[PDB]
Amino acid sequence: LRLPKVKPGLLKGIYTDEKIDLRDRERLELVESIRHPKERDFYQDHTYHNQWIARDLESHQKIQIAGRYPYFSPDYEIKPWIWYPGDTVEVVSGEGAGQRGAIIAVVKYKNEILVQNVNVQDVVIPASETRPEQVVQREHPISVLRVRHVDPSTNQLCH
């Protein structure tokens, strides 16, 4: 909170123009050949211990997987459901605090909302050899925790 935060490569100091990670899958033929022919690595096909036992994840692994899919909790939905397609709602806080737009769709189990023109991003569409790389702009699901309704008379906050 004290000093500015810019692109992680500019004031940090190690500025590269193209980082290459060799541990990826694409670069397998680049590493599996760099090492000597005399560097034999066994267990290429079979492991030693029994791997069809059921096991947990790393500590840090759950921590990542609990934040992605939180609705797997019991009753993650909002206890009364008051957001519906066609509602007249305005955002409140966060990015673009104060825009007005009508709901078009609701993702109920996630406590979020698809609202016109608010929080619009470019849904890139990777494609196989038939179509090229396609990009498509599309507004995104935003949480209902940060939107309130445009009262058809007072046009203010209204539960």
Binding site: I78, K79, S93, A97, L145, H159
Partner: protein, 50 residues
């Protein structure tokens, strides 16, 4: 950043700023602990308005 209940404009000025709410610590807990504290921001308004 404080002045008696009537001298509320004369604080150290700021920039684009909108009073969000009062920092009632239970705003962090689950929504049933924010269904309480619902009107406690409404009620507190006219207490600092003359």
């Amino acid at each position: 950043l404080n002045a008696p209940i009537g001298r509320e404009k004369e604080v150290q000025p700021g920039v684009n700023r909108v009073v969000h709410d009062m920092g009632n610590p239970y705003r962090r807990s689950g929504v049933r602990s924010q269904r309480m504290f619902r009107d406690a921001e409404k009620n507190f308004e006219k207490y600092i308005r003359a």
